[PDB]
Design an enzyme around this catalytic site. Structure first.
Site: not given
Ligand SMILES: O[C@H]1C[C@H]2CC[C@@H](C1)N2Cc1ccccc1
Ligand SMILES: O[C@H]1C[C@H]2CC[C@@H](C1)N2Cc1ccccc1
Lengths: 299, 304
Positions: A40, A142, A144
């Site tokens: 993505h 964290g 992506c």
């Protein structure tokens, strides 16, 4: 003494890189001459509503992909898609590539996550795959592209890649071959995690860990059937115990002399009556993010 | 919000993994920290099991030469060229500077501050965890006795601040150690004698910072509209084995109080009510326990 630890993240730090496509920047896993990242990253703000990733991918040129390793920028010479991960063929092989595997885990199994931002590692934590297929963690745990991994004598078993953070303080992702864990899609759409449950096989392993260290007040003289326990555990939203799980706990049952269905009767009473102001391994709550092997391997 | 379901994270241990070595003196073997041409390790590696009750480290060290120490980094042996003792740490000078040496400082921490520990057995890193510095000057870690020489550290802008080295197991299962200059934390000696850590308490300033972190993320169920004096709060908190809050702690929570509009003493009254009622099912930032190992420094920086 019993505290939860993550694996040493040194081998994974040497693989983390920054991947930028247009305005979107996220983390990538650099192994040999390939960079793995969520697909993505090629999404637009305006097109992540029902993207047709492979059609968008076959038309983005290699120069659209900006890959940074520290201050070295890796030149993308190719790109392909496998499920929900994007593969970027780069002109340079990572000299810090460790001995590694791509594995898929299953709910209840544990691994370490190297939290990263803009390809640079910020922290590491130990976690487990929740039964609902989510991993508990915040936006500060964290972004992506962060990866989950286990270490087995010098070999890094990559098992997870962060893809999205859900509004309930958990995140979901795929394995390193692009297959999501759970009923999630890499789309900006209304997605919610299902009703989470307790990993029963991990609690018993953690209760075994208390026995091995001499905390044995919870041991009783009773045994239960596998289903009578499962009928009770489910009522407390505890993931049902399978015969597979009973088998995996075998070594701990043989080493402590407590049959699994014996310890199940102890856990059963713990569920219905609480701990009554007492503690187990110094904790007033039952830990369910210790696999049986985590105990066998630390204890 | 930003911190929903937050998990304690240890610092990435890569820069410390490149410094762990194995130090052996006779039959005793433990972990060493290799920085430049010096290997740091607990001085009780020169002790046998019989020496550990009343060891004379000066007498034992003065009888050792450079060739008595075996230092191994992976598969390479490091010839030792010098050895000296600084308090409770042994300093072995080697002919090879660690090419893996990161940017590092030696810092002594106070009770309540947090750091990462890289648990190592015979110089090989086994795992990493994040812990806090308990008020009784211990740390609740996990070992196998080989972890002697494992170091505690923080990382700031790729500079590794070393703050702890593990030395002892105390009979209560917790750990005691020194700083990298050899000074023990607390009233402990690197001696296998009857040592008892005083009863541990809860780091109240860390819990209040944790509660301020929850408000910033919209978790307000525990708040009440009461305030309290600093003395009245300390009178109640100590009966729950919570640490007396000082005016210094009140000042540290200033930026958190100003960011949320909740006075520090107001937050204290909410914590006082949490102690009398308990949580018992309800969660705060996704945790069913009152977190006391997350410092105000970390909360303020993560919520600008
Ligand atoms: O997604 C999670 C894993 C599985 C599937 C639904 C639920 C949550 N689990 C089963 C279950 C049902 C009742 C009681 C306990 C567990
Ligand atoms: O060693 C630690 C630091 C100090 C001094 C002893 C104890 C633990 N702390 C004081 C204290 C006791 C009870 C209740 C509240 C505070």
């Amino acid at each position: 003494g019993f505290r939860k630890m993550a694996f040493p993240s040194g081998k994974v730090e040497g693989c983390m890189v920054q991947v930028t496509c247009g305005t979107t920047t996220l983390n990538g896993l650099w192994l040999d001459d390939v960079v793995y990242c969520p697909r993505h990253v090629i999404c637009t703000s305006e097109d992540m509503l029902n993207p047709n990733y492979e059609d968008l991918l076959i038309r983005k040129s290699n120069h659209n992909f900006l890959v940074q390793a520290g201050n070295v920028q890796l030149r993308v010479i190719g790109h392909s898609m496998q499920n929900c991960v994007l593969k970027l063929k780069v002109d340079t092989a990572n000299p810090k590539t460790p001995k590694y595997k791509f594995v898929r885990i299953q709910p209840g199994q544990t691994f370490s996550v190297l939290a990263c931002y803009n390809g640079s590692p910020s922290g590491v934590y130990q976690c487990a795959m929740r039964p609902n297929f989510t991993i508990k963690g915040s936006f500060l745990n964290g972004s992506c592209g962060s990866v989950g991994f286990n270490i087995d004598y010098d070999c890094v078993s990559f098992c997870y890649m962060h893809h999205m953070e859900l509004p309930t303080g958990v995140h979901a992702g795929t394995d390193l071959e692009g297959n999501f864990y759970g009923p999630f899609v890499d789309r900006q759409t209304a997605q919610a995690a299902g009703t989470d449950t307790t990993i029963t096989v991990n609690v018993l392993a953690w209760l075994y860990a208390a026995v091995i260290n001499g905390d044995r007040w919870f041991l009783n003289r009773f045994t239960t059937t596998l289903n009578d326990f499962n009928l009770v555990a489910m009522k407390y939203n505890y993931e049902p115990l399978t015969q597979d799980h009973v088998d995996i706990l075998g070594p701990l049952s043989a080493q402590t002399g407590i049959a699994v269905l014996d310890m199940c009767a102890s856990l059963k009473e713990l569920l219905q009556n609480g701990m009554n102001g007492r503690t187990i391994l110094g904790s007033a709550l039952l830990e369910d993010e210790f696999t049986p092997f985590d105990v066998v391997r630390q204890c």
